[PDB]
Design a protein around this ligand. Structure first.
Ligand SMILES: [Cl-]
Ligand SMILES: [Cl-]
Lengths: 175, 174
């Protein structure tokens, strides 16, 4: 049934189609726009950009993410920080391994015609928070290893790129 | 268009994986077991699911021989053989069992069999030990894994059987 695919589409919490919903709700003119090569900048994402953004996103680093993140996604990140400020607790987490770092989609959207690159990856990390003064764990485990999933909407300037939309999720992969 | 079919084709969500093979009305399936829907859903979370998953992680085959039919037990026995080929045994433990619900009821295409699809999520630790001095081979004792289960039910007049079974892969961290 077509209804089952439709239900699965707008009900799944995989970062990639979460992102895909808010771009839509062909790829030929996208790759010619930037000129650089897809394959040459795929490993350049995996080399520097992705690890540098992830460890920043995990530790709670705002000054670096303010650069990469656009006006709206950074706002929704800073708003997530309020609660941690309110609970008087700080982010103490790190990223162990980042495997799965490739460019899936390439599309342009409704407001004007901004070209966009969609980057998906899986990461391995622990997520814990310590009390601002006692340095004691408030929430989160080290013993527990977390398998996260990511979807980044990239754009270019006509340091380097900008994140148009970002989402942390959970990978079904055990490693 | 492209994007909606591609997901349905390439998703490893146990639920739609099971549902992808089936697709090759509910009211005709339910009143055929007479029994009721909600009395089965609570009987799953309190008898069947705990009883079947208990055996799955521990490897207990004398239980899964009763519930599993020939095709998915073939899939399970073959997986288990490789554990033995490594002198390893399944010392797993399911800690929590939360997500328990019959998501769909369908009649298969080959013949008119009444089928009920049960969606599931569970907290568990995966661990393996050697034969002599059963200690460690695989997994971590203090690492909680979230697993997504899916299963297809029917009965032959401890009552039910399982024709299809797939496991593993929750997006939930807890
Ligand atoms: Cl995944
Ligand atoms: Cl999914």
């Amino acid at each position: 049934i077509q209804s089952l695919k439709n239900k699965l589409w707008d009900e799944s919490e995989n970062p990639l189609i979460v992102v895909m919903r808010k771009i839509t709700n062909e790829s030929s003119r996208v790759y010619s726009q930037f000129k650089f090569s897809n394959e040459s900048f795929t490993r350049h994402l995996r080399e520097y950009i992705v690890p540098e953004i992830l460890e920043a996103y995990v530790k709670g680093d705002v000054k670096v993410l303010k650069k990469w993140f656009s006006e709206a996604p950074f706002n929704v990140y800073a708003a997530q920080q309020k609660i941690f400020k309110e609970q008087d607790v700080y982010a103490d987490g790190r990223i162990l391994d980042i495997r799965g770092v490739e460019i899936v989609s390439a599309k342009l959207l409704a407001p004007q015609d901004i070209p966009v690159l969609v980057v998906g990856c899986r990461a391995q990390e622990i997520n814990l928070y310590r009390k601002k003064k006692t340095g004691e764990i408030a929430a989160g485990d080290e013993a527990n290893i977390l398998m996260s999933s990511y979807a980044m909407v990239f754009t270019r300037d006509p340091e380097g790129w900008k994140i148009l939309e970002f989402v942390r999720g959970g990978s079904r992969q055990f490693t």
